[PDB]
Amino acid sequence: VRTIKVFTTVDNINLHTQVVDMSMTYGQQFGPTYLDGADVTKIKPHNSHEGKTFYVLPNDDTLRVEAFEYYHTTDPSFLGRYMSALNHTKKWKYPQVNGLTSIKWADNNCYLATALLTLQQIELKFNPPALQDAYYRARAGEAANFCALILAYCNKTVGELGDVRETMSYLFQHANLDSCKRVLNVVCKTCGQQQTTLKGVEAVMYMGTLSYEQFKKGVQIPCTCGKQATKYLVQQESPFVMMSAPPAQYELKHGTFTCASEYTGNYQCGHYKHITSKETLYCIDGALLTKSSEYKGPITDVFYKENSYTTTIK
Ligand SMILES: C[C@H](c1cccc2ccccc12)N(C)Cc1ccc(O)cc1
Ligand SMILES: [Zn+2]
């Protein structure tokens, strides 16, 4: 009986020394097993594997607890989906563009590039250690883990077409946004006034208008009565807001917004670009960079810096 020593892990924080029988597969000994993302379940140990870290599914109570504390999910399929995706995302290129980690276009990843660029520019704190750790590695240029985690947390596979808004909405579920608050007032000529308070994700996201200033002045929405009513923002407590709408021609003015998602196409096939306001307006399109003083284009999401707003409407 010849053997080597390897580490197994669910989180790559807590390594568990194992003695492996070189006659048997990794699958026979540990169950499903991954080496740097590669499925080695059906492979036999090699002498070069001495002292290397393998990922395994949480198949015991110690590991289930470690996995839950790192990823904040009990979904048994999660590690398999993370590893499947990582196997592809570790072959992507992560260009530095304008001081930010982007992604070179591959596998319809334009929505992930736009999400990743947005996350580097808004004040957001992840709860799962897995996302905290992977985000700091992405800020440093190696975003492969962060991208694979986003794909796993969103239940998306590499190659699938994606929506920036739908993606930020899953990521915001795993962010600490508990002390974010929004107060709206709706005015109908028929039904009268209605004041609502929103907490967490619903307090930082709005679908129907790109303009934060228009949301403060009032926007037309269908009432339940069938008339148009006016919704306006009474109070906002959050480090940012995301205003979204089906894509339309829109003017972005330097200094009036943090960043935005341009989308060219239809629901079914399209391409995202990212626009950011610095000393001028930069358009980051994967690896490709352009700049201009002004932008007019099909915008679907705009991000605004915020702290505390109270309306002056009485
Ligand atoms: C920005 C764009 C979109 C959102 C909302 C309304 C739209 C209307 C027309 C065209 C695109 C639209 N999304 C990328 C669509 C989409 C939504 C979910 C997906 O899984 C893949 C693509
Ligand atoms: Zn009404």
Coordinates of all heavy atoms in Angstrom, one line a residue, residues 188 190-191 223-225 227, ligand 2:
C188 N -52.9 59.9 -6.3 CA -53.9 59.6 -7.3 C -55.0 60.7 -7.1 O -55.4 61.0 -5.9 CB -54.4 58.2 -7.1 SG -55.5 57.7 -8.4
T190 N -58.0 60.1 -8.0 CA -59.2 59.2 -7.6 C -59.0 58.7 -6.2 O -59.9 58.9 -5.4 CB -59.3 58.0 -8.6 OG1 -59.3 58.4 -9.9 CG2 -60.5 57.2 -8.4
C191 N -57.9 58.0 -5.9 CA -57.7 57.2 -4.6 C -57.1 58.0 -3.5 O -57.1 57.5 -2.4 CB -56.8 56.0 -4.9 SG -57.4 54.9 -6.2
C223 N -52.0 53.5 -11.5 CA -52.7 53.2 -10.2 C -53.5 51.9 -10.4 O -53.6 51.4 -11.6 CB -53.6 54.3 -9.8 SG -54.2 54.1 -8.2
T224 N -54.0 51.2 -9.3 CA -54.8 50.0 -9.4 C -56.2 50.4 -10.0 O -56.8 49.5 -10.6 CB -54.9 49.3 -8.0 OG1 -55.5 50.2 -7.1 CG2 -53.6 48.9 -7.5
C225 N -56.6 51.7 -9.9 CA -57.9 52.2 -10.3 C -58.0 52.4 -11.8 O -59.1 52.5 -12.3 CB -58.2 53.5 -9.7 SG -57.2 54.8 -10.2
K227 N -56.3 54.8 -13.7 CA -55.7 56.2 -13.9 C -54.1 56.1 -13.8 O -53.6 55.1 -13.3 CB -56.2 57.2 -13.0 CG -57.7 57.4 -12.9 CD -58.4 58.0 -14.1 CE -59.7 57.4 -14.5 NZ -60.1 57.6 -15.9
Ligands
ZN2 ZN -56.1 55.5 -8.1

